[PDB]
């Protein structure tokens, strides 16, 4: 079965809002809300991957970020390891740089059912901050 390492960024502003995008209708986890991120490539580290993926997907460079959670999740047709980085400082203003919907969402209002099921413990832990 396909095995992937994924790095994602939890982009949190000073008003306790998170920058959330929505996945394409033809993607794995189609139409789900998501933290921006993507596949860790050969020859790059998880830290380098979350920087690159946020630059590509939402046009910011995360800096002075921390590992919030690392977990593994078995989907019906693939196994992924997710690296959730908490990003509270960055250069740039996040936007839908790849044409995808993105918007700021209050942390308290996040509904884990809107995200891939792999995110459930992370969304819960975020609400405990
Ligand atoms: N980006 C992201 N992916 C997540 C989250 N939760 C979760 O289970 N996933 C899963 C969905 C996908 O199987 C995988 C993410 O891969 P991706 O489709 O974002 O990869 P990518 O951006 O490198 O893909 P692409 O540029 O090649 O289209 O991890 C999340 O919060 N953010
Ligand atoms: O692994 C993240 C962890 O490392 C620290 C230093 O102890 O931060 C370093 O790593 C981050 C990710 O690459 C950098 O953004 C940061 O600038 C660097 O100091 C911790 O702050 C963090 O929890
Ligand atoms: Mn991507
Ligand atoms: Mn990618
Ligand atoms: Mn992605």
Query: By C-alpha distance, which of 5, 102, 9, 86 is closest to 55?
Result: 9
| Structural contact between residues 83 and 6, judged by C-beta atoms closer than 8 angstroms | yes
Which residue has 């400082």 as its token pair? 89
Closest atom, ligand 1, to C-alpha of 118: 8
For the CA atoms of the chain, what is the radius of gyration?
Answer: 14
Indicate which residue's Cα is closest to atom 22 of ligand 1. Answer: 38
Q: Resolution of the experimental model in angstroms, please?
A: 1.7
| Structural contact between residues 96 and 19, judged by C-beta atoms closer than 8 angstroms | no
State which approach was used to obtain the coordinates. Answer: X-ray
Which helix (H) or strand (E) segment is 56 a member of?
A: helix 46-58
Query: By C-alpha distance, which of 70, 28, 65 is closest to 50?
Result: 65
Ligand nearest to the backbone CA of 83? 1
Which residue has 């992937």 as its token pair? 4
Pairwise CA distance, residues 109 & 65, whole Å: 23
Pairwise CA distance, residues 23 & 4, whole Å: 18
Q: How far is the CA of 66 from the centre of ligand 4 (A)?
A: 20
Q: In 10 A of CB 71, how many CB atoms?
A: 14
Closest atom, ligand 2, to C-alpha of 65: 15
List the domain boundaries for the chain.
1-129
């Amino acid at each position: 079965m396909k095995k992937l390492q994924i790095a994602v960024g939890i982009i949190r502003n000073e008003n306790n809002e998170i920058f959330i995008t929505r996945r394409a209708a033809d993607a794995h986890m189609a139409n789900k809300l998501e933290f921006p991120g993507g596949k860790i490539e050969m020859g790059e580290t998880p830290e380098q991957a979350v920087v690159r993926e946020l630059q590509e997907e939402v046009g910011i460079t995360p800096q002075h970020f921390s590992l919030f959670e690392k977990l593994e999740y078995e989907f019906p047709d693939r196994h992924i390891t997710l690296w959730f980085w908490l990003v509270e400082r960055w250069e740039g203003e996040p936007w839908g740089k790849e044409g995808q919907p993105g918007e700021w969402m209050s942390l308290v209002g996040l509904n884990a059912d809107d995200f891939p099921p792999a995110n459930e413990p992370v969304i819960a832990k975020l609400k405990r901050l």
